[PDB]
DNA sequence: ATCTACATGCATCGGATGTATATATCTGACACGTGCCTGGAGACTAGGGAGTAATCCCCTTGGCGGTTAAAACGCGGGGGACAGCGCGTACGTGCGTTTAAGCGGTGCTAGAGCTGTCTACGACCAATTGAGCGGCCTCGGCACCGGGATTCTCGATGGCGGCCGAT
DNA sequence: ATCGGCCGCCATCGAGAATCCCGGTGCCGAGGCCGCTCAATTGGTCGTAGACAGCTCTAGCACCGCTTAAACGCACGTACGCGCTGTCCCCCGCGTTTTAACCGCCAAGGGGATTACTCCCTAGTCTCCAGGCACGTGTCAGATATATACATCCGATGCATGTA
C-alpha cells in the first residue's frame, strides 16, 4: 500500500523527458493526420519518409518552447497549473493568433 | 423582514457548535448563519462587521490571521 | 598550390568562389570576398563544434550527437541570440524546472 | 546516381582540429552541415543587399565585414572579424 | 468526410510534451486547446509545403518542402537539409 | 540629381477607387514604402524559387507559387486572379 | 505602351528593367513583371479602398496616414501580412481592456 | 472643491493618446540620447533631421506594443496596475531576451 | 549615462496610457529607461555599422530603415 | 431601557467640469502646366535554358501478425485556484512655480554629390588534373541490460508546547 | 482552575520506490580506403566597373533671443496592491482494464530522377523618342481660433438599516 504525494511522479517525469531527445508523438497516428488534413489541399499525395520525420520535429519543438512560455504565463498568475488563458496569452503575445 | 436573533448572539452560537482548537473561521460562521437562522443578502455584510467592533472590545480574541480574514476564538 | 592551402583554411575557398559568381548576390565577385568568407565559416564552424565537443566528453561520449549541438547553443548566450530563430532536430530541452514548481 | 556536393569532408577535418580524439555522429553532422549552409545563405543575401544600397556592381570583401558586425553578437562579430581579415591577409601573400 | 486523426494524440502524449516543457500541473481543457493549436499549425505548414511541391510538378512531398516552408514561417529546422 | 519614384502611379490607383479623395505628403511616402517592401519580398522568395528548383529564369509561373506562400488564403486568391487575368490580357494584342 | 497593353495602370517596363538589373536571376521571364505589376495594382487597391473608406469615415477629403494604420489592423487579412511592420505617425488602435473599465 | 477620484481622468487620457497620433516623447531630450549612445560606436557623428526621427518613431512603436502585451500579462494575473514583473515576462516570451 | 534620464516622467506616464494601463508602479520608470537605452544602442549599433560600411560621418534614414530591418522591424515612411 | 439620532450602502440629481461642434478665415502644401532627357519600346540577331518524351529505379504506399508498451478509465483526495478582509501606502490629481523647448533670425562651411578620366579588376574562357564524392566494409563507441549502490521521498512514531472543554 | 487531557505542530528514523553508477555485451554506423569524374585552377585577353581627383552648392551645425507651454516640486489622500487565510473542487497519483502503436518484413508501382534532343524565349545591341521628372506658379482644403453645444463625472441629498 505504498502511494507518492501530488507533486512528484510529474516532476521525475519532467526531468526524465527533458533529458531525452526522443520523440514523444506516436508516429503512426502523426503520418494519419498529415495525411486527412493535407488531403484538404490535395488529393493523393506521396510523402517521402523524411518528410513525415521532419514534420514531428517540428512540432513538438513548437509545442515544447510554447509550453515553456505557456508555464511562464500560468506561474505568473501565480499558478502551478497551466490553463487555456496563458495558451491564449502566450500566442497573443507571440504573434501567431 | 426575517426574523433572526442578534448578529453579536448569530457569530457566537457558530463559534460554540463547532469546537475547534484551532477556533472557528468567520466563513464557516455565515454557513451556519444561513442555514440555522433565517438571513438576507445583507448577512454576510454585516457578519463582516459585527467581526469589526466585538474584536477590539475584548469579546473576541485573536487566533492566526488579522481582521475578518484569519481565525478567532470567543474570549472567556 | 590549391587556393584554400594559400589562404590557410580547410574550407574550400574555390568552392566560395564559384557559389558567388553562380548565387545571384552581384554581377562581378571580389577577388578577396570568398577568402573572407571561408574564414568566417571556420570560426564560426569550430565554436559549435568545440562546445559541442565539451559536451560530447562530459557525456562520457566521443561521437557528437545533435543532443550535444543543441547543449552547446543554448547555452552559450551569443549562440542562442544567433540561432534563435533555428530549431535543433533531436535536440531536445535542456533539463530546466522553475524552482516555485518543486515542494519544500 | 549523381555526385552531389556537400560540406561533410571539411567539417571533419575542422572536428579534428578542435578534438583530436572527438568524433560526430551522422545526424549531428547533417545539423552542422544545414548550419554552414544557412550561414552562408544569410551573410551572402546581406552582403547583396548591401552591394545594392550602395550602388556597387561588384561584392568586395569590404561588404563581408560590415555584414558580419550587424548579424553576429558583439563578442563573435569582434573575434570573426578577426580571423576573416587575418585569413585574406595570408591569402594575398601567397 | 473529415476523418479527425487529430484524435489520434493521446492525452498521455500530450501530458508528456508539457513535462518536457517543464510544467508541473495540466489543466484538463489544455488537452483539447493542443489539438486545435496542432491542427492550425500543421494546416498553415503543410498548405505552403504542399505548394511548393505542386510549383514543382511533383505529386510527392519532399522534405525539402517542409524545409522551405517552415523557414518562411519563421522557424528554420537543421538537420533535414537546407 | 534626378529620382524616380511611384507617386505617379499610386495616385491614379487612389483616383479609381475613390474620385473624391486626396493624399498627404506624408501618407504617400508611407505607400512608397510600401510598394518597394513587396516587390523585394516576393521577388526574394521568387529568386529563391527559381533557385531551389534549379531554373536559371524566374517567370510569370514562379511569381504565383511566391504569391500563394505569403498572402493569406483569401488574400492570396483574389491576387492570383487579378495576376492570371492581366498576363492572358498582356499576350491578347 | 506596354502598360496599355497589359491593362495594368503599374509601368511593367520599369519592372522589368529593375528585375534584370537587380540580381533575381540571369534572365527574366516576358510575362513575370507583367504578373508582378497587376498583384502589386490589387494590393495597392485593397490597400487604398480601406484607407479610402477610412478617408470618408473621418469626414477629411484627403488621406493621411492615421487613415492608414486603421485600415490594416482592422483587416483581418492586411493585419497578418503587415505584422512585422510598424506605420510611422499611425498610433495605435484603440483597445481598452474591460477590466479597466469601473463597474 | 472639484476634485476627482483616480483612475478615471487617466481612463480619459486612455482614449485621449489612443485617439491622438502625436509623439509623446519630447523631441530635444531624446536627440540628445541618440547623440549620447550613437558616441559609442562612432565619434563626430552627424545626423540628418529626419534620422534621428526615425529613430523616435521606431522607439516609440516599439514600447507602445510592449505596454499592450505587458498590460496583458497583468490583467492575466488579475492586476490592474503593471509592474516590471509584467515587462520581462513578455520580453522573454517574444525571443529578444532569453 | 547623462541626457538617458531627459526621458521625463510625464512621457513615460502617457505611452503607458496608450498602450492602455490605468495604474503604472513606481520601479517601471527606471525599467524602460534601460530597455530603451539597449534598444537605441542595438539599433544604433547596426545603424553606424551601416554608416561606416558607406565611408560616411553622416546617418542617412536610409541607415535606420535598413537597420530596423535587418532587426526584423521594419518602419515605412522613411525612404522604405 | 426607549427615543433620538449617527454611520453606511446603493440609486437620483445637480452643477461643472473638460469635449465636442461650428462658422469663419488664414495658409502653405497639394494641384496643375512645360521644357528637358535619358529611359522604355520597338527591331533584330543569337543561343542556351527549358519543355518534352523516354527510360531508369529509388522508395513510397499498402499489408499483416504479435508483443507489449502506451493509453484510457476510474476513484480518491491533496494542495493549489480563488474571493474576501485589511492593512498599507504608492500612486494620481491638481497648484504654483520653474525650466527651456519651440519658433524665427541668418552665417558659415563641412561634406554630399555629379562629373570626367581610364586604370586596376574580375568576367569570360579553354585546357587540365586532383579535390572530392559515390560505394563499400571494418569494428569500436554506444545503446542496452542486469545489479548493486545511493539519493531522496514520506508515512509512521514518539515528543511537546499552547489551550480547550471535562473529571 | 490544576488538570490530565488533547488537538496542533515538530523532528529523526525507516521503509521503499527511483535514479545513479558499473561492468558486461551486442550491433549499427562512423571512419578509413578507393576509383570515377567533374569542378577547382591556371594562363590569356579586353571591356568596363570603380578608384579617385576636382568642382558644385546644398544642408547641417550654430549662436541669438524671446514666448509661452511643458516640466517640475509639492501636498494631500484614495483606490488598489498583496500577504494571510478560508474554503472548495480541480487534477495528480496510479491501479486496473483496454487499445493500437510498433516491429519486421516486403509486395507493388507510382513517380522522382536522369538523360537526350528540339526550339522558343530573352539578353544584347542599336536607333528612336515620349513618359516622367525638375521646377515655376496656383488656391482650396484644413490647421487654427474663439464661440456655442453638451457629454461625462462626482459631490450632494435620501430613503433605507439596524447600529451602539
Redesign the pocket.
Known sequence: ?????????????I??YQ?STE??????????LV?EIAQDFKT?????????MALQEASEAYLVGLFEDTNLC?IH?????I?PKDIQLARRIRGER | ?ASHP???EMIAAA??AE???????????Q?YIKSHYKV?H?A???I????????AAGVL?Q?????????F??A? | ????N?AGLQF????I?????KGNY????????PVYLAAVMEYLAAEVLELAGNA?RD???????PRHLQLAIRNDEELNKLLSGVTIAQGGVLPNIQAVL??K | ??????????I?KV??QVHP?????????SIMNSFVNDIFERIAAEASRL?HYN????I?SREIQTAVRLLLPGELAKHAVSEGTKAVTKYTSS | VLRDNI??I????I??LARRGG????????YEETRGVLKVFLENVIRDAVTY?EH???????AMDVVYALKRQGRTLYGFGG
Do not use: C, W
Not at chain 1, 77 to 81: G, I, L, P
Open positions: 500500500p505504498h502511494r507518492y504525494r501530488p507533486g512528484t511522479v510529474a516532476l521525475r517525469e526531468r526524465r533529458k520523440l514523444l508523438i506516436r508516429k503512426l497516428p502523426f503520418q494519419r495525411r493523393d499525395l506521396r510523402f517521402q519518409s523524411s518528410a513525415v500560468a498568475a501565480k499558478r502551478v497549473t490553463m | 423582514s442578534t448578529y453579536s463559534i460554540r469546537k475547534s482548537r484551532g477556533g472557528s473561521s468567520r466563513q464557516s460562521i454557513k438576507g445583507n454576510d455584510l454585516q463582516k462587521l459585527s467581526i469589526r467592533r466585538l474584536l480574541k487566533t492566526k490571521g488579522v481582521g475578518a480574514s484569519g481565525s476564538r470567543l472567556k | 598550390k590549391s587556393r584554400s594559400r574550400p575557398v574555390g568552392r568562389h564559384r557559389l558567388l559568381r552581384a554581377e562581378r565577385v571580389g577577388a578577396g570576398a560530447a557525456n562520457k561520449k566521443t561521437r557528437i550527437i518543486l515542494p | 546516381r549523381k555526385r552531389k556536393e556537400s560540406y561533410a569532408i571539411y571533419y572536428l579534428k580524439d572527438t568524433g560526430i555522429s551522422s545526424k549531428a553532422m552591394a550602388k556597387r556592381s561588384t568586395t | 484524435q489520434g493521446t492525452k498521455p502524449a501530458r508528456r510544467v508541473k500541473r495540466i489543466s484538463g481543457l489544455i511541391t514543382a510538378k511533383r505529386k510527392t512531398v519532399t
